[PDB]
Amino acid sequence: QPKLLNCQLKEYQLKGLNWLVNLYEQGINGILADEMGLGKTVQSISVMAYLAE
Numbered sequence: 001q002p003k004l005l006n007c008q009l010k011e012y013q014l015k016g017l018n019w020l021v022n023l024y025e026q027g028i029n030g031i032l033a034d035e036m037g038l039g040k041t042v043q044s045i046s047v048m049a050y051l052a053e
């Protein structure tokens with residue numbers, strides 16, 4: 001995970017970042033459709049922080 005976050009991703013989010021990164025580096029787009037309140041707003045920040053770090 002990007003150390004830039006000053007935060008910890010949960011298990012179900014860290015694998016979710018890997019999905020986000022894999023689609024990005026393979027040049028394709030996707031839907032993060034997780035159930036409400038699971039933290040989709042957080043996984044969103046984590047992929048930007050990866051593109052930064």
Ligand SMILES: Nc1ncnc2c1ncn2[C@@H]1O[C@H](COP(=O)(O)OP(=O)(O)O)[C@@H](O)[C@H]1O
Pocket residue numbers: 007008009010013035036037038039040041042
């Ligand atoms: N890894 C995490 N560490 C701390 N708080 C988290 C984490 N993931 C989610 N949250 C908390 O979950 C709450 C709701 O998540 P949010 O992403 O807004 O739901 P939604 O997926 O509807 O956007 C937020 O206040 C956020 O602080």
Ligand code: ALF
Pocket residue numbers: 035036037040041
């Ligand atoms: F349940 Al949400 F943004 F997906 F509040």
Ligand SMILES: [Mg+2]
Pocket residue numbers: 040041
């Ligand atoms: Mg949201």
